[PDB]
Amino acid sequence: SEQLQALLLEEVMNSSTLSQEVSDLVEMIWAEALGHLEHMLGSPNPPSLAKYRALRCKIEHVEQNTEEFLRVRKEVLQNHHSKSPVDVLQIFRVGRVNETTEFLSKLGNVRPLLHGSPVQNIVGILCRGLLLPKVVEDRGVQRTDVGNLGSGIYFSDSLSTSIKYSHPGETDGTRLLLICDVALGKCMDLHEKDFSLTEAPPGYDSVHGVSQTASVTTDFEDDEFVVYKTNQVKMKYIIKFSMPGDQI
Ligand SMILES: Nc1ncnc2c1ncn2[C@@H]1O[C@H](C(=O)N2CCN(CC(=O)Nc3cccc4c3CNC4=O)CC2)[C@@H](O)[C@H]1O
């Protein structure tokens, strides 16, 4: 029958909705997260379409020769201050289901910034977006629960600082960080830590910890940008990269 011939072809057309480079990535971030829970609880390739659909997030490969690739690769390495070599492997356009509509694009000062995260967090981040940390009020607010700015979402403009948070995964030793449009708004510059910040100071939309220099000493080794409402973040790219000074 011809009806049967058409359904088998639609299965082909379904499985092809997933580039090989994107299936391989979805495998790795899933592998990394399963390897991590196995470890704290006791311990080509066929298109793994099932795992990608659960992320409710669209991931496209930008080809390593595209015009888009060389431009984005330039912007990541643009403020690489510690010139310890980095090999930018792959770049993926990204789009969360609800992110493009909830985004507060109308604040102004929308700037593209870097958020690093260990590889096991990537499944969580792609399914739910970048989440605010949980405030602590059952006990004394230690230095282990907050960052240097308070309970917010942290970005930098420098690959040198995002490499401090983009820890290499156990699966392949590659590092991931996101590129996100961040609606900064009115941005208060800070020179001293504040761990009590649950929101931006009055009249401002975000806060910026200013990195120490020989002229101006502050409490910040790195430039830190923090926002306090999740819909000031729109993820735009995943960057797969690797540090040569990781081997041997
Ligand atoms: N949906 C989600 N699924 C999984 N992990 C998720 C998630 N939303 C947020 N996270 C993860 O939670 C973490 C988090 O909030 N916090 C709380 C605040 N943060 C402060 C801090 O030092 N971060 C920090 C500071 C400066 C730069 C950079 C970062 C992280 N990325 C950077 O380039 C420390 C960790 C964060 O590392 C993020 O990767």
Residue numbers in the entry: 316 to 358, 367 to 571
Sentences reproduced from the published study:
PARP4 is an ADP-ribosyltransferase that resides within the vault ribonucleoprotein organelle. PARP4 is an ADP-ribosyltransferase that uses NAD+ as a substrate to synthesize ADP-ribose modifications on molecules. The PARP1-homology region of PARP4 includes a BRCT fold, a WGR domain, and the catalytic (CAT) domain. However, PARP3 and PARP4 contain the catalytic triad H-Y-E but are considered MARylation enzymes, indicating that other structural features are important determinants of catalytic output.
We also determined structures of the PARP4 ART domain alone (CATΔHD), which provided higher-resolution insights into the active site configuration that gives rise to PARP4 mono(ADP-ribosylation) activity. The HD was replaced with an 8-residue linker (GSGSGSGG) connecting L282 to S365. CATΔHD crystallized in complex with EB47, and in complex with NADH, the non-hydrolysable reduced form of NAD+. The CATΔHD/EB47 crystals diffracted to 3.0 Å and belonged to space group C2221 with three PARP4 molecules in the asymmetric unit. Again, only two PARP4 molecules contained EB47 in the active site, due to a crystal contact in the active site of the third PARP4 molecule. Structure refinement yielded a crystallographic R/RFREE of 0.203/0.248. An alignment of all of the ART structures determined in this study did not provide any evidence of flexibility in the acceptor site region of PARP4. This analysis suggests that the positioning of residues surrounding the acceptor site region are largely static. We have also determined crystal structures of the PARP4 ART fold that illustrate that multiple alterations to the ‘acceptor’ site have rendered PARP4 incapable of PARylation, despite the H-Y-E motif.
